[PDB]
């Protein structure tokens, strides 16, 4: 059981790459732009399917958006286009650092978390999104958990298989085992203050549409 835990953690790590890519000032500029998105949403300036409001987390879908296992892509033009600042301040930096190739990203999602916010065990929908999955963290430091049985069976299994620190300005790249063979989630105790994340992905050619 102890050997199994270590081997699974090793397998998860094989699909994780992480680098400190954005400086303090660069984060500050991007954070200002994230605040602008929140403000624009409150002004009713985005399309219906661009904005998903939930108690401790808002999701903002750009480029492509979607609706367990039966997720569907919204018809073309239903969500707002990827903001120019996302190209200029985020995607450009990633391309220049060879994290992903030019033209890969067609989906940018911003998750904005309140303190005590979380996400329940899930796999990024395999029928919707190509791999790798790239995420960049902003307002504060947190942790991303892998192997989330503990959210449902706390007496039988208390902890995740692996907890990955996700610092402000850090870029996390998920592939292989970490993207496909294990669930991930965020524990509410790990979000002590506002945290945002920009998730950059490519939708699959045959991602099923509504
Ligand atoms: Mn996810």
From Swiss-Prot:
SS bond partners: 148-185
Top enzyme class: oxidoreductase
Active site: 66
Per UniProt, location of the Glycyl lysine isopeptide (Lys-Gly) (interchain with G-Cter in SUMO1) cross-link in this chain: 13
Main location, first listed in the record: nucleus
Positions with a binding annotation for 2-oxoglutarate: 111, 113, 122, 184, 195
EC number: 1.14.11.53
Subcellular location per the Swiss-Prot or TrEMBL entry: Nucleus speckle
Coiled coil, from the record: 1-43
Effect of residue 183 to A: Strongly reduced interaction with RBM33, leading to decreased RNA demethylase activity
PTM-bearing positions, type Phosphoserine: 14
PTM comment, free text: Acetylated by KAT8 at Lys-153, promoting interaction with PSPC1, thereby facilitating recognition of N(6)-methyladenosine (m6A) mRNA by ALKBH5. Deacetylated at Lys-153 by HDAC7.
Outcome of swapping residue 14 to A: Decreased phosphorylation and subsequent sumoylation
Protein name: RNA demethylase ALKBH5
Species assigned in the record: Homo sapiens
Lineage: Eukaryota, Metazoa, Chordata, Craniata, Vertebrata
Gene that encodes the chain: ALKBH5
Residues included from the entire protein: 74 to 292 of 394
